[PDB]
C-alpha cells in the first residue's frame, strides 16, 4: 500500500537558537506530499537517509 | 549519514486518526550524533519477542518560520509549485 | 566601524587607499542636510500662528472633521489620526544605533510643529480668505468668500445666496464620504509606502553583504586575525576591503540618485501648497 | 575641541555652525576566558611513537577528540626536517579549540615529500593520496633512516 | 567562549533554550546569547555604547568657547543637558522660546548672545477677530522691491586619462 | 546689498562644491594603493617588468576607480544645475515679458513687474509688488432689498460706516453711492440670508 | 515637416544614445582585463585550477 506524507519530516537543521524569523535552509529533507510505502523482515535500501515512521 | 557522522532524530506525539499519517506540523528534536565513519547502503528492522512507513530523503531548499519561543511552526517547500 | 570592525591593524592598512571616506561621509551629510530643507520649504510659509475663534457661524459647513481636537495625543484631527494609523517605533527614547556603524538621526521638526503649521494654515484660510498670503489677514464671512470664489470661474454670485443650504449639505456629505473611504480602504496611501520599502530594502541589502568571503578564507575579521601570522594575514585582509568598499560606494550612489527625485517631489508639493491653498 | 574642529576644517578660522569631528567608544578591560571541563592527556605521542607505519596505497587514519592538545611541546622539538604548516599558523595552535582532529600516517621516499600539498599534480599526489583544494591541518615529515633501511 | 571572541556587556538572559542548543542569535549572524561551558548558565551579549561627537560654536570671530554634543548616547556613563538626539555638555537650559540660528535636532536648538539651548518658537501668535457681519478693507498701500538669485551654470572642466 | 554680505550664498556654495571636488580628485594622485611607490617614474627606473607590471596594475586600477567616482559626482551635479537653469528660464519668461497671476511665484504680494540683472554665474531678479496697509473694518451685507427686489453688486462689496451704505472695491477703500448702474437685481429677497432694508 | 531634414532631432539622439550604450556594453566582453586570454573556455582548458 502507498500513502501521502503531507507535511511530515521536518527537523531542526542546526544547533542555533532563533526566534521570530523566517530562515531559508538547504539540506536533505523529505519532499512535501511525498509517497510513503506501507510495509508489514525485508532488507531495504538506504540511499542517503531514511525517514522511518511507525504507529 | 553525512561525512562520517551518523545522526538520529525522533519525536513522539499522540494522534486521533487510525488510518494513516495525520495532518499537522511538528518539528523533530535531535537525540544521537555518532562519529562512526563507516558507510551504510542497506538496513533492516528488528522485532521483539506491525507496520512502518519508509520514505527517502532528497536534497531540497526549505523556508522555515520560527515563533517567539524558538519552535518551528510551519515551513514552505520551494521546489513544489 | 563598517569596514574594519573595531580593529587596529585593519584601520592602519585601510590608510593606504588614500581618502576614499571623506566623500561618502560628505555625500551622506549633504543628503541629511537637504532632507530638512525639503520639509522646511513646504510647511514654513506662514509668518504668524492664527487660531480659529470660539465662534462657529460658518453658514452651515462643519469643519469639525479636520480642525484640531484638544483631547488628542498630538492635538491632531480625525483625518490625520486615520492617516497615521494607516501607515506602517524607536521614538520613545534614545535607542538609535547599531553595531555595524549605521545610525538614524531624528528630524529637526517634530510632528507637533508640523501639526501646528497645518492648523495655522487651515485657520488662516478659513477666517481670512486669500488675503493672508500677500499682507495681513482681513476677516470676511465665509459665505461672502465662497460667493467671491464662484465669481472667479464664471458663475455669478446670486447662485450661492439662493442655494446655500444645498451646497452646505453637499459639502458635508462629501466630507463624510471621504472619511468613510479613508477609514475603510488602506491602499490609497500607496505613494508613501514605496519610499519606506525601498529605503528599508536597500539598507537590508547593505547589511546582508558583510557575511561574504569575497575570496578570503573567512567572512569575519577577528578569526583571520586570530589564526594567521601578520606577515601573511595582510594578503587575506585584502580582498575583504575591496568588496566592502564597493558595496558602500554603490549604496551611496543609489541614495543620491533616489534623493534627487524626492527633492523634485518636494518642489512640486511646495508649488501646490503655494498656489492652490493660499490662492485660487 | 576647537583645535580638533580646526584640524577637521584645515583652517584657522571657523564660522557659525555645527561640525562633526570624531567619535568615541568605551574601552573594554578585564578580559575573561572560559574553556571546557576536561584535562585528560592526549595520545598524540603514540602516533609518532608508532614502531610500524603503513604503505602509501593504504594509509593509516586515527580520529582524535576529547583532548587537551599541546603543540608547543611538539613544535620545540628540533628532530624534524620539514614542518611547513599551512592552514593557520604553528605558534597560534595553542590558542585555538577545534571539534575533531584527523591524523594520517604513512612513509615515503625523500624525493616525494615536496609533493604533499594542494593544487599540484604528479604520480603519488594524483594516484595514492590526494589532498583537497581547501587546505590541510598541516603535514609533518621527519627523517627515519634506521627503521626501514 | 571556546574560541568565540567578542566585546560587550554580559547580562543574565531571559530567553529559554532547548537542551541541545549551544548559542542563540538573531537576523544576520549577531550572536545574542551564549551558554558558558562551566556553569551551563545562559548569558546575553550586547555591545557597550559608542557614537559620534559634534561641536557647536558661535565662530572664532565672536567667541572662543564651544559646546559638545554626544550623539545617540545616554549621559549616565560618558551643565549636562539631556536631549532626544543625544546629550549636550557646556550649554545651559532656558525655558524661554526664541528663534534660533544653530539647529540641533528634535525641536531643540542652541544659539549665542552663554551658549543657551531651548525649543525653537514657531512664530508670533495672534487671533483674528472673526465675525459674520463685519469685514476689513485697507486704506493705504506700499510698493516693495524684492530680490532673488538663481544659478544657471558652472565651470567647464576637462580631464584626460593618459 | 552694498552693506550686508552673504546675500549670494547659492553661487558661493556651488563654486565651493566644485572646487572642493576637484581638489579632492587631484589629491588622490599621491596615494600608494598598496604598491611600493606613488610615482611611476621611480618604479619604472628601479625594477624589471615581471613585477613592475603588477605595481603598475595596482596604481592604474586605483586611479581609474577615483576618476570614475569623480565623473559620476559631476554628472549628478550637472543634472541639478540643469534643473535650476530650467526654473530660471521659466521665471524669466513668465515674469519679465508679461505679468504673473499665479500667487507667490514672483515676490510676496501682488505682482507688478520685474527687472533682470546679471551675475558671475547666475541671474538676479528684482520684483516690484503692491502691498496693502492701514486697515479699517466696517459692517457688510450680502444684498439690499428695495421695493421687494434683491440688489447685488456687480463688482465690489457693500459696507456701512454706521448710518449709510456704500459700494467699495475689494483691494482699496473708495465709497460710492448705491445707484442702479452698479447693482443688478435678481428676483425677490425672502430666501437670502442677511438682507438689509435700504 | 516632410521637406527639411533633421527636424525630429531629440528622438534621434535618444535612440542613438541607447544604441551606442548597448553596443559599447557588448563590446567590452572581448577585452583582456590583464588576463592571459579573453576567452574563458580556452583558458580553463589550458591550465590547472590554481
Ligand atoms: C511561549 O512561551 C510562553 C512562556 O513559556 C507561553 O506562555 C505560557 O502559556 C501557557 C499556556 O497558555 C500558560 O499556562 C503559561 O502561564 C504561560 N506562561 C507565561 C509566562 O505567560 C506561550 O504560550 C508560548 N507560546 C507562544 C505562542 O507565546
Ligand atoms: C457638524 O456636523 C456633524 C455632522 O452631524 C456633527 O457631528 C455630530 O454632531 C452631533 C450633534 O452634537 C453629535 O451628537 C454627534 O456625536 C456628532 N458625530 C460624531 C461622529 O461625533 C458635528 O457635531 C457638527 N459640529 C458642529 C460644531 O455643529
Ligand atoms: C440638483 O441636484 C441636487 C443633488 O444633486 C438636487 O438636490 C436633491 O434633490 C432631491 C429631490 O428633491 C432630494 O431628495 C435630495 O435630498 C437633494 N439633495 C440634497 C443634498 O439636498 C436638486 O434638487 C437638483 N436641482 C433640481 C432643480 O432638481
Ligand atoms: C614517545 O613518547 C615519549 C613519552 O611520551 C616521548 O618521550 C619524551 O620526549 C621528549 C623529547 O625528547 C622529552 O622532552 C620528554 O622528557 C620525554 N618523556 C619521556 C617520559 O620519556 C618520546 O619523545 C615519544 N617519541 C616520539 C617519536 O614521539
Ligand atoms: C539612561 O539610563 C537609565 C538607566 O537605565 C534609564 O532609566 C531607565 O530607562 C528605561 C528605558 O531606557 C526605563 O524603562 C526605566 O524605567 C528607567 N529607569 C529609571 C530608574 O529611570 C534612562 O531612561 C536612560 N535615559 C535617560 C535620558 O536618562
Ligand atoms: C477691527 O475690529 C476689532 C474689534 O475690536 C479690532 O481688532 C481686534 O481687536 C481685538 C481687541 O479688542 C483683538 O483681540 C483682535 O485680535 C483684533 N482682531 C484683529 C487684529 O484681527 C479693531 O478695533 C478693528 N480694527 C481696526 C483697524 O480698528
Ligand atoms: C451672525 O448671524 C446671526 C444669525 O445667523 C445674526 O443674528 C442672530 O440673531 C438671533 C435672533 O434671531 C440671535 O439670537 C443671535 O444671537 C444672533 N447672532 C449672534 C451671533 O448673536 C447676527 O447678527 C450675525 N452677525 C453677528 C455679528 O453676530
Ligand atoms: C457716514 O458717511 C456719511 C457720508 O459721508 C456721513 O454723512 C455726512 O456726515 C458729515 C459729517 O460732518 C455731514 O457734514 C454731511 O452732511 C453728511 N452727509 C449727508 C448726505 O448727510 C455720515 O456722517 C457718516 N457717519 C459716520 C458715523 O461717520
Ligand atoms: C424691511 O421692510 C419690510 C417691509 O416694510 C419688513 O417686512 C415687514 O415686517 C413687519 C414686521 O415684522 C411685518 O408685520 C410685515 O408683514 C412685513 N412685510 C411687509 C410687506 O410689511 C421687514 O421686516 C423689514 N426688515 C427689517 C430688517 O427691518
Ligand atoms: C504512489 O505510488 C503508487 C504506485 O507507484 C501510485 O499508484 C500512487 O498514485 C502514488 N501516489 C502519489 C500521491 O503519488
Ligand atoms: C566542572 O568541573 C568542576 C570540578 O570537577 C565541577 O565542580 C563542576 O560542577 C563542573 N561543571 C559542570 C559539570 O558543568
Ligand atoms: C567679525 O565680527 C565683527 C563683529 O561681530 C564684524 O564686524 C566683522 O565683520 C566680522 N568679521 C568677518 C570677517 O566677518
Ligand atoms: C522653566 O522656568 C520657569 C521660570 O519662571 C519656571 O516657572 C518653570 O517651572 C520652568 N520649567 C520647568 C519644567 O522647570
Q: What is the DSSP string of B6-57?
A: EEEEE-----S-SSSPPS----BEEEEEE------SEE----------EEE-
Do residues F28 and C19 touch, judged by C-beta distance below 8 A? yes
Q: Could you tell me which residues of chain F have a Cβ less than 8 Å from any Cβ in chain C?
A: 24, 27-28, 30-34, 62, 66, 69, 72-73, 76, 79-80, 83, 102-105, 108-110, 131-133, 135, 137, 140, 142-143, 150, 152, 157, 170, 186-187, 191-194
**Residue E98, beta-bridge partner list:** none
| Alpha-carbon span B68 to B78, nearest angstrom | 24
Sheet of E23-26: strands edge to edge?
A: A16-17, E23-26, E30-35, E42-46, E9-12
The continuous run of DSSP H or E covering A17 comes out as strand A16-17
Gap between the terminal Cα atoms of chain E: 55
Distance between alpha carbon C118 and the CA centroid of its chain, in Å?
A: 15
Collapse the DSSP code of D105 into the 3-class scheme (helix H, G, I; strand E, B; otherwise coil) and give the result.
Answer: strand
Q: Is B69 in the pocket of ligand 1 (CB under 6 A)?
A: yes
* Burial of residue C108, with CB atoms counted within 10 A of its CB: 0-12 exposed, 13-18 middle, 19 or more buried: buried
List C-alpha distances in Å: G8 to F128, G12, G17, G19, G20. Answer: 41, 7, 15, 17, 19
| Alpha-carbon span E94 to E113, nearest angstrom | 13
Which candidate, E47, E51, E118, places its Cα nearest to that of E78?
Answer: E51
Cell (9 digits) for A48: 542517503
From the CA atom positions of chain B, what is the Rg in Å?
16
List C-alpha distances in Å: C130 to B15, E145, F104, F105. Answer: 75, 21, 12, 15
Do residues E39 and D32 touch, judged by C-beta distance below 8 A? no
Distance between alpha carbon F153 and the CA centroid of its chain, in Å?
A: 37
What is the resolution of the experimental data for this entry, in Å?
Answer: 3.2
Q: Is F161 in the pocket of ligand 8 (CB under 6 A)?
A: yes
Sheet of E102-105: strands edge to edge?
A: E92-93, E116-119, E108-111, E102-105
For D79-88, b/e burial (b = at least 16 CB within 10 A) is eeeeeebeeb
Residue count (chain G): 50
Interchain contact, G50 vs D120, CB within 8 Å = yes
Which candidate, F134, E131, E140, places its Cα nearest to that of C128?
Answer: E131
Collapse the DSSP code of D114 into the 3-class scheme (helix H, G, I; strand E, B; otherwise coil) and give the result.
Answer: helix
| Alpha-carbon span D29 to E48, nearest angstrom | 12
From the CA atom positions of chain D, what is the Rg in Å?
26
Do residues C16 and F34 touch, judged by C-beta distance below 8 A? yes
Which candidate, G4, E29, E5, F115, places its Cα nearest to that of D97?
Answer: E5
Which candidate, F58, F23, F27, places its Cα nearest to that of C18?
Answer: F27
Cell (9 digits) for C66: 479636520
List Cβ neighbours of E103 (8 Å cut-off, separation of 6 or more).
C36, C108, D18, E109, E120
Do residues B43 and B54 touch, judged by C-beta distance below 8 A? no
How does DSSP assign F75-125, residue by residue? HHHHHHHHHHHHHHHHHHHHHTSS---STTSSSSSEEEEEEEEE-SSEEEE
From the CA atom positions of chain E, what is the Rg in Å?
29
| Alpha-carbon span F148 to F166, nearest angstrom | 20
Which candidate, C2, F112, D81, F119, places its Cα nearest to that of E50?
Answer: C2
| Alpha-carbon span G23 to E159, nearest angstrom | 24
Collapse the DSSP code of A29 into the 3-class scheme (helix H, G, I; strand E, B; otherwise coil) and give the result.
Answer: strand
Collapse the DSSP code of E158 into the 3-class scheme (helix H, G, I; strand E, B; otherwise coil) and give the result.
Answer: coil
| Alpha-carbon span D112 to D107, nearest angstrom | 10
F56 DSSP assignment:
H
Sheet of F144-146: strands edge to edge?
A: F183-188, F149-153, F144-146, F196-197
**Ligand that comes closest to the CA of residue E83:** 5
Residues of B in contact with A51 (CB under 8 A): 54-57
| Alpha-carbon span F67 to E158, nearest angstrom | 12
| Alpha-carbon span C206 to C253, nearest angstrom | 13
D132 DSSP assignment:
-
| Alpha-carbon span E131 to F138, nearest angstrom | 11
| Alpha-carbon span B7 to B33, nearest angstrom | 5
Interchain contact, C144 vs F80, CB within 8 Å = no
List C-alpha distances in Å: F49 to E119, F42, F54, F55, F60. Answer: 67, 13, 9, 10, 15
Question: Residues C191, C194, C199, CA angle at the centre, nearest 5°?
Answer: 140
What distance in Å separates residue F108's CA from the closest CA in chain C?
6
F167 DSSP assignment:
E
- Is the C-alpha dihedral spanning C59, C65, C66, C68 positive or negative? positive
| Alpha-carbon span E68 to C33, nearest angstrom | 20
| Alpha-carbon span C145 to C138, nearest angstrom | 11
Which candidate, A17, F97, D123, places its Cα nearest to that of E35?
Answer: A17
Cell (9 digits) for C253: 550612489
Cell (9 digits) for C146: 465662497
Q: Which residue of D has its CA nearest to B36?
A: D63
For C41-54, b/e burial (b = at least 16 CB within 10 A) is ebbebbebbbbbee
How does DSSP assign chain C, residue by residue? --SSTT-SHHHHHHGGG-STTHHHHHHHHHHHHHHHHHHHHHHTT-SSB----S---SBTB--TTTS--SSSSSS--HHHHHHHHT-----SSS----TTS---PPPSS-HHHHHHHHHHHHHHHHHHTTTTTTSS-----HHHHHHHHHHTTT--THHHHHSHHHHHHHHHHHHHHHHHHHHH---S--HHHHHHHHHHHHHHHHHTTSS--TTSS-S-HHHHHTTS-TTTHHHHHTTTHHHHHHHHHHHHHHHHHHHHHHHHHHHHHHHHHIIIII--
Gap between the terminal Cα atoms of chain D: 77
- Is the C-alpha dihedral spanning F84, F86, F89, F94 positive or negative? negative
Backbone φ and ψ for G18, nearest 5 degrees, come out as -60, -45
Q: Ligand 4: residues within 6 Å at CB?
A: D 45, 48-49
Q: Is E63 in the pocket of ligand 5 (CB under 6 A)?
A: no
List C-alpha distances in Å: C120 to C141, C274, E108. Answer: 18, 15, 21
Cell (9 digits) for F60: 592604474
| Alpha-carbon span C191 to C87, nearest angstrom | 11
Residues of D in contact with B2 (CB under 8 A): none
List C-alpha distances in Å: F41 to C19, D16, F27, F48. Answer: 23, 45, 18, 13
Interchain contact, B70 vs A31, CB within 8 Å = no
Cell (9 digits) for G5: 531634414
Residues of E in contact with F128 (CB under 8 A): 143-145
Chain D contacts in chain C segment 24-53 (CB below 8 A):
29
Residues of F in contact with E153 (CB under 8 A): 81, 85, 121-122
User: How many other CB atoms sit within 10 Å of the CB of residue C34?
Assistant: 14
Cell (9 digits) for B15: 494522534
| Alpha-carbon span C145 to F157, nearest angstrom | 11
Backbone φ and ψ for E149, nearest 5 degrees, come out as -115, 135
Largest CA distance in chain C: 94
Does E150 contact C at CB distance below 8 Å? no
F19 DSSP assignment:
H
| Alpha-carbon span C216 to C239, nearest angstrom | 6
Do residues E138 and E114 touch, judged by C-beta distance below 8 A? no
Interchain contact, E25 vs A19, CB within 8 Å = no
Collapse the DSSP code of E115 into the 3-class scheme (helix H, G, I; strand E, B; otherwise coil) and give the result.
Answer: coil
List C-alpha distances in Å: E137 to C132, F167, G50. Answer: 13, 12, 90
List C-alpha distances in Å: E62 to D89, D133, E58. Answer: 60, 68, 7
What distance in Å separates residue G37's CA from the closest CA in chain D?
22
Cell (9 digits) for C230: 601578520
Cell (9 digits) for C35: 532632507
| Alpha-carbon span D66 to D100, nearest angstrom | 8
How does DSSP assign C55-83, residue by residue? ---SBTB--TTTS--SSSSSS--HHHHHH
Do residues D148 and D107 touch, judged by C-beta distance below 8 A? yes
Collapse the DSSP code of B76 into the 3-class scheme (helix H, G, I; strand E, B; otherwise coil) and give the result.
Answer: strand
User: For ligand 5, atom 6, which residue shows the shortest CA distance?
Assistant: E74
Beta strand pairing status for E23-26 and D60-64?
unpaired
The continuous run of DSSP H or E covering E82 comes out as strand E80-82
**Cell 594509509 sits on residue:** D59
Method by which this entry was solved:
cryo-EM
List C-alpha distances in Å: D85 to D106, D129, D138, F57. Answer: 18, 18, 5, 31
| Alpha-carbon span F131 to C134, nearest angstrom | 7
Does D99 contact B at CB distance below 8 Å? no
Atom of ligand 10 nearest to the CA of A33: 13
Residues of G in contact with D120 (CB under 8 A): 48, 50
How does DSSP assign chain G, residue by residue? --SSSS-SHHHHHHHHHHHHHHHHHHHGGG--TTSS-S-HHHHHTTS---
Do residues E16 and B69 touch, judged by C-beta distance below 8 A? yes
The continuous run of DSSP H or E covering A42 comes out as none
Chain C contacts in chain D segment 29-68 (CB below 8 A):
none
User: How many other CB atoms sit within 10 Å of the CB of residue C11?
Assistant: 12
Beta strand pairing status for B54-56 and D17-25?
unpaired
Collapse the DSSP code of F43 into the 3-class scheme (helix H, G, I; strand E, B; otherwise coil) and give the result.
Answer: helix
Distance C78 CA to ligand 2 centre (A): 13
User: How many other CB atoms sit within 10 Å of the CB of residue C237?
Assistant: 21
Q: Which of C159, C162, C164, C166 to mutate to test the pocket of ligand 3 (most atoms within 8 A of CB)?
A: C166
| Alpha-carbon span C248 to C260, nearest angstrom | 19
| Alpha-carbon span F179 to F194, nearest angstrom | 20
User: How many other CB atoms sit within 10 Å of the CB of residue F73?
Assistant: 19
Residues of B in contact with D60 (CB under 8 A): none
| Alpha-carbon span F58 to G34, nearest angstrom | 11
Question: Residues E80, E81, E86, CA angle at the centre, nearest 5°?
Answer: 105
Amino acid at each position: 500500500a502507498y500513502t501521502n506524507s503531507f507535511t511530515r519530516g521536518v527537523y531542526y537543521p542546526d544547533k542555533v537558537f532563533r526566534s521570530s524569523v523566517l530562515h531559508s535552509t538547504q539540506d536533505l529533507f523529505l519532499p512535501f506530499f511525498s509517497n510513503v510505502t506501507w510495509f508489514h523482515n525485508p532488507v531495504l535500501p538506504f540511499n542517503d537517509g531514511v525517514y522511518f515512521a511507525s504507529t | 549519514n553525512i561525512d562520517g557522522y551518523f545522526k538520529i532524530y525522533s519525536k513522539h506525539t499522540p494522534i486521533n486518526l487510525v488510518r494513516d499519517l495525520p495532518q499537522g506540523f511538528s518539528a523533530l528534536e535531535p537525540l544521537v550524533d555518532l562519529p562512526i565513519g563507516i558507510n551504510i547502503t542497506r538496513f533492516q528492522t528488528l522485532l521483539a519477542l506491525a507496520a512502518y512507513y519508509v520514505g527517502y530523503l532528497q536534497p531540497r531548499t526549505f523556508l522555515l518560520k520560527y515563533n517567539e519561543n524558538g519552535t518551528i511552526t510551519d515551513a514552505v517547500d520551494c521546489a513544489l509549485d | 566601524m563598517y569596514i574594519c570592525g573595531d580593529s587596529t591593524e585593519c584601520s592602519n592598512l585601510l590608510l593606504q587607499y588614500g581618502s576614499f571616506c571623506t566623500q561618502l561621509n560628505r555625500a551622506l551629510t549633504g543628503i541629511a542636510v537637504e532632507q530638512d530643507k525639503n520639509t522646511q520649504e513646504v510647511f514654513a510659509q506662514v509668518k504668524q500662528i492664527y487660531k480659529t475663534p470660539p465662534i462657529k457661524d460658518f453658514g452651515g459647513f462643519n469643519f469639525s472633521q479636520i480642525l484640531p481636537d484638544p483631547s488628542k495625543p498630538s492635538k491632531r484631527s480625525f483625518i490625520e489620526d486615520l492617516l497615521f494609523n494607516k501607515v506602517t517605533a524607536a521614538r520613545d527614547l534614545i535607542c538609535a544605533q547599531k553595531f555595524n556603524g549605521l545610525t538614524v538621526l531624528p528630524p529637526l521638526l517634530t510632528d507637533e510643529m508640523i501639526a501646528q503649521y497645518t492648523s495655522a494654515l487651515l485657520a488662516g484660510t478659513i477666517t481670512s480668505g486669500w488675503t493672508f498670503g500677500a499682507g495681513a489677514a482681513l476677516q470676511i464671512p465665509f459665505a461672502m468668500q465662497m460667493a467671491y470664489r464662484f465669481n472667479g470661474i464664471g458663475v455669478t454670485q446670486n447662485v450661492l445666496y439662493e442655494n446655500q443650504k444645498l451646497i452646505a449639505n453637499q459639502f458635508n456629505s462629501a466630507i463624510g464620504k471621504i472619511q468613510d473611504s479613508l477609514s475603510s480602504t488602506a491602499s490609497a496611501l500607496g505613494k508613501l509606502q514605496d519610499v519606506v520599502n525601498q529605503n528599508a530594502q536597500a539598507l537590508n541589502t547593505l547589511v546582508k553583504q558583510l557575511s561574504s568571503n569575497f575570496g578570503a578564507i573567512s567572512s569575519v575579521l577577528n578569526d583571520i586575525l586570530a589564526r594567521l601570522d601578520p606577515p601573511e594575514a595582510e594578503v587575506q585582509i585584502d580582498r575583504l576591503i575591496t568588496g566592502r568598499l564597493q558595496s558602500l560606494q554603490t549604496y551611496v550612489t543609489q541614495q543620491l540618485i533616489r534623493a534627487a527625485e524626492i527633492r523634485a517631489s518636494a518642489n512640486l508639493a511646495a508649488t501646490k501648497m503655494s498656489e492652490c491653498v493660499l490662492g485660487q | 575641541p576647537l583645535s580638533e574642529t580646526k584640524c577637521t576644517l584645515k583652517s584657522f578660522t571657523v564660522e557659525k555652525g555645527i561640525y562633526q569631528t570624531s567619535n568615541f567608544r568605551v574601552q573594554p578591560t578585564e578580559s575573561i576566558v572560559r574553556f571546557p571541563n576536561i584535562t585528560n592527556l592526549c595520545p598524540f605521542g603514540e602516533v609518532f611513537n608508532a614502531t610500524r607505519f603503513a604503505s602509501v596505497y593504504a594509509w593509516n587514519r586515527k580520529r582524535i577528540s576529547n583532548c587537551v592538545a599541546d603543540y608547543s611541546v611538539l613544535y620545540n622539538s628540533a628532530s624534524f626536517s620539514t614542518f611547513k604548516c599551512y592552514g593557520v599558523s604553528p605558534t597560534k595552535l595553542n590558542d585555538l579549540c577545534f571539534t575533531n582532529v584527523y591524523a594520517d600516517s604513512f612513509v615515503i621516499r625523500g624525493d616525494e615529500v615536496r609533493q604533499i600539498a594542494p593544487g599540484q599534480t604528479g604520480k603519488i599526489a594524483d594516484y595514492n593520496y590526494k589532498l583537497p583544494d581547501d587546505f590541510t591541518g598541516c603535514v609533518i615529515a621527519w627523517n627515519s633512516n634506521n627503521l626501514d633501511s | 567562549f571556546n574560541g568565540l571572541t567578542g566585546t560587550g556587556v554580559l547580562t543574565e538572559s531571559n530567553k529559554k533554550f532547548l537542551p541541545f542548543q549551544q548559542f542563540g542569535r538573531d537576523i544576520d549572524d549577531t550572536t545574542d546569547a551564549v551558554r558558558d561551558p562551566q556553569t551551563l548558565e545562559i548569558l546575553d551579549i550586547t555591545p557597550c555604547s559608542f557614537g559620534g561627537v559634534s561641536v557647536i560654536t558661535p565662530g572664532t570671530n565672536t567667541s572662543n568657547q564651544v559646546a559638545v554634543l554626544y550623539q545617540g548616547v545616554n549621559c549616565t556613563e560618558v551643565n549636562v543637558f539631556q536631549t532626544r538626539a543625544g546629550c549636550l555638555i557646556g550649554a545651559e537650559h532656558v525655558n524661554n522660546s526664541y528663534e534660533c540660528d544653530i539647529p540641533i535636532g528634535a525641536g531643540i536648538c542652541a544659539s549665542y548672545q552663554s551658549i543657551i539651548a531651548y525649543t525653537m518658537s514657531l512664530g508670533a501668535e495672534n487671533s483674528v477677530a472673526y465675525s459674520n457681519n463685519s469685514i476689513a478693507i485697507p486704506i493705504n498701500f506700499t510698493i516693495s522691491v524684492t530680490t532673488e538669485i538663481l544659478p544657471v551654470s558652472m565651470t567647464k572642466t576637462s580631464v584626460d586619462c593618459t | 546689498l552694498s552693506s550686508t554680505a552673504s546675500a549670494l550664498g547659492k553661487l558661493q556654495d556651488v563654486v565651493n562644491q566644485n572646487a572642493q571636488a576637484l581638489n579632492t580628485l587631484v589629491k588622490q594622485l599621491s596615494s600608494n594603493f598598496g604598491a611600493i611607490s606613488s610615482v611611476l617614474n621611480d618604479i619604472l627606473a628601479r625594477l624589471d617588468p615581471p613585477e613592475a607590471e603588477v605595481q603598475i596594475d595596482r596604481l592604474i586600477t586605483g586611479r581609474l576607480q577615483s576618476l570614475q567616482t569623480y565623473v559620476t559626482q559631476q554628472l549628478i551635479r550637472a543634472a541639478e544645475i540643469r534643473a535650476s537653469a530650467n526654473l530660471a528660464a521659466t521665471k524669466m519668461s513668465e515674469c519679465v515679458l508679461g505679468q504673473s497671476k499665479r500667487v507667490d511665484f514672483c515676490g510676496k504680494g501682488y505682482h507688478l513687474m520685474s527687472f533682470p540683472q546679471s551675475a558671475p554665474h547666475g541671474v538676479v531678479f528684482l520684483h516690484v509688488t503692491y502691498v496693502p496697509a492701514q486697515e479699517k473694518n466696517f459692517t457688510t451685507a450680502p444684498a439690499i432689498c428695495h421695493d421687494g427686489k434683491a440688489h447685488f453688486p456687480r463688482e465690489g462689496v457693500f459696507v456701512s460706516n454706521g448710518t449709510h451704505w456704500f459700494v467699495t472695491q475689494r483691494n482699496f477703500y473708495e465709497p460710492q453711492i448705491i445707484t442702479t448702474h452698479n447693482t443688478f437685481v435678481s428676483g425677490n429677497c425672502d430666501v437670502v440670508i442677511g438682507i438689509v432694508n435700504n
